[PDB]
Amino acid sequence: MGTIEISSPSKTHILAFPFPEKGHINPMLHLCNRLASKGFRVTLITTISTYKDVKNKIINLESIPDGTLGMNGYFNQFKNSVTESVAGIIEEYKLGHDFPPPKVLIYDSTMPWMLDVAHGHGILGASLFTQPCCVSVVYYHMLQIDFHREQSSSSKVLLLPCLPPLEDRDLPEFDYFKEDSGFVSNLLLNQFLNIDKIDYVLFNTFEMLESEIANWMSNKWKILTIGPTAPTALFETNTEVCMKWLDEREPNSVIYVSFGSIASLTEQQMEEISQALFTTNFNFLWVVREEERTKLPNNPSSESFTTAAGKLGLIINWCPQLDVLRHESVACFMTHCGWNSTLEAISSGVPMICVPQWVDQTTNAKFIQDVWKIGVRVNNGLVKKEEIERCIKEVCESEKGKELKRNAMKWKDLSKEAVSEGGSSDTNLEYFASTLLFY
Ligand SMILES: C[C@]12CC[C@H](O)C[C@H]1CC[C@@H]1[C@@H]2CC[C@]2(C)[C@@H](c3ccc(=O)oc3)CC[C@]12O
Numbered sequence: 001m002g003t004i005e006i007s008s009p010s011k012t013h014i015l016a017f018p019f020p021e022k023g024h025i026n027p028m029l030h031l032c033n034r035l036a037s038k039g040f041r042v043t044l045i046t047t048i049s050t051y052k053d054v055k056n057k058i059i060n061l062e063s064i065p066d067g068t069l070g071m072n073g074y075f076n077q078f079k080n081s082v083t084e085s086v087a088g089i090i091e092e093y094k095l096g097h098d099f100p101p102p103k104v105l106i107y108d109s110t111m112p113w114m115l116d117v118a119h120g121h122g123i124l125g126a127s128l129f130t131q132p133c134c135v136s137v138v139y140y141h142m143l144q145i146d147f148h149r150e151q152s153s154s155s156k157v158l159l160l161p162c163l164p165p166l167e168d169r170d171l172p173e174f175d176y177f178k179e180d181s182g183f184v185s186n187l188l189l190n191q192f193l194n195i196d197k198i199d200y201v202l203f204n205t206f207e208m209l210e211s212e213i214a215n216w217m218s219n220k221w222k223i224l225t226i227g228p229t230a231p232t233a234l235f236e237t238n239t240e241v242c243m244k245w246l247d248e249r250e251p252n253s254v255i256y257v258s259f260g261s262i263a264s265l266t267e268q269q270m271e272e273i274s275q276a277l278f279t280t281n282f283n284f285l286w287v288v289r290e291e292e293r294t295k296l297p298n299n300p301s302s303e304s305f306t307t308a309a310g311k312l313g314l315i316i317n318w319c320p321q322l323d324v325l326r327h328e329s330v331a332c333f334m335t336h337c338g339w340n341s342t343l344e345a346i347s348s349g350v351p352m353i354c355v356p357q358w359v360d361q362t363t364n365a366k367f368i369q370d371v372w373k374i375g376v377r378v379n380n381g382l383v384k385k386e387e388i389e390r391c392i393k394e395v396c397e398s399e400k401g402k403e404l405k406r407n408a409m410k411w412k413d414l415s416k417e418a419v420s421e422g423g424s425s426d427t428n429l430e431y432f433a434s435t436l437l438f439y
């Protein structure tokens with residue numbers, strides 16, 4: 001005689017709340033996909049202005065007001081609005097009868113105040129970092145070593161535990177934001193203000209990729225490396241168009257070019273890249289967002305070209321990046337080195353030409369070229385066509401490039417192993433799921 005009680009994923013409710021930008025939404029969506037496939041009930045909370053985006057990419061979906069002035073006011077409003085918004089949702093779900101009450105809130109690492117919403121309403125908090133471990137620990141040391149730089153007087157090289165030496169150009173780039181550099185800096189530093197009170201510290205990376213620094217952070221804070229959250233081999237826009245075009249190219253013949261969802265290049269920088277791509281011995285697929293089309297050399301959603309070299313080019317406002325990168329036609333990836341684009345390239349075996357723009361993109365580029373050895377970084381600040389030309393020859397037409405390709409194929413296998421049964425990332429994500437079930 002008695003009652004047995006069963007705690008299983010299908011009666012466990014996970015809340016997820018990304019920062020409303022595609023580089024933060026996308027990795028969180030993939031993680032929600034993996035968690036739902038384990039049987040969990042997953043509710044994704046997102047701002048109204050990103051809601052339609054996420055709806056088209058798909059899991060229960062909740063919208064909250066955008067919550068929005070200069071950078072500082074814009075952001076204090078944002079933090080205040082989403083605090084009460086998300087708190088309301090937790091409480092509606094705690095009294096609801098359909099879904100189970102929330103057990104945990106997975107929130108973006110850049111919204112650390114959400115840990116206080118989670119704990120203030122009696123549920124657990126998991127902080128999802130969308131940056132690699134290596135650059136993240138740079139933010140921690142900065143929050144805690146002199147990082148000022150009078151780059152005009154002398155060159156400095158910084159040594160930190162479990163990191164390669166970092167030149168000034170390898171540190172995170174904040175001066176780009178000029179007046180707002182301090183704001184962007186504090187946003188990334190403050191990720192660590194409560195690192196000791198977080199119930200789960202989640203990183204979208206895999207241990208073999210960052211083993212030295214992952215271990216150092218595992219010792220300090222017991223982090224969980226659970227990446228890549230994207231699947232091995234999201235409904236994005238223009239899928240059929242780009243897949244048909246790529247299906248019509250020769251294998252290993254296409255340079256894929258994209259600077260992500262936020263970065264905006266000067267008109268002179270666009271002219272340089274343009275002139276390189278139209279004279280290279282390769283086809284190209286170049287994503288230029290609608291908002292950036294007017295900065296192209298003197299607006300249609302896409303344009304087709306026969307290049308001066310007799311090759312074929314496609315300029316298009318958006319593509320399915322993961323599908324593009326895994327297409328056999330792609331020879332290499334000219335990228336701003338956002339972490340999602342970097343980790344997607346790694347998981348796809350595609351070598352890179354690094355054109356980093358700001359924040360962690362400079363550090364990622366350093367690791368792409370000198371640590372993982374799967375790409376080369378351009379040298380500035382304007383990057384001229386001849387410099388872009390040099391990097392294409394090196395990646396795509398050289399013995400060194402064949403080696404870079406070999407290195408990328410190795411890392412592709414290692415990230416597949418990480419997310420497969422018994423891999424470090426599969427194990428860490430199962431640690432997260434299983435301990436959510438504990439009494
Ligand atoms: C958070 C952010 C992306 C991820 C990483 O932490 C680096 C950050 C860079 C700065 C921040 C971006 C996000 C968009 C901005 C708010 C967006 C912006 C700028 C001005 C404004 O009024 O509203 C939004 C453009 C860039 C942005 O300011």
Ligand SMILES: O=c1ccn([C@@H]2O[C@H](COP(=O)(O)OP(=O)(O)O)[C@@H](O)[C@H]2O)c(=O)[nH]1
Nearest residue numbers: 023026260261262287319321338339340341
């Ligand atoms: O044409 C494109 C360009 C980018 N992305 C996606 O945009 C996301 C985030 O980009 P990233 O982190 O590299 O840099 P950001 O856009 O934040 O600057 C990635 O998941 C990419 O797959 C896409 O789907 N199609």
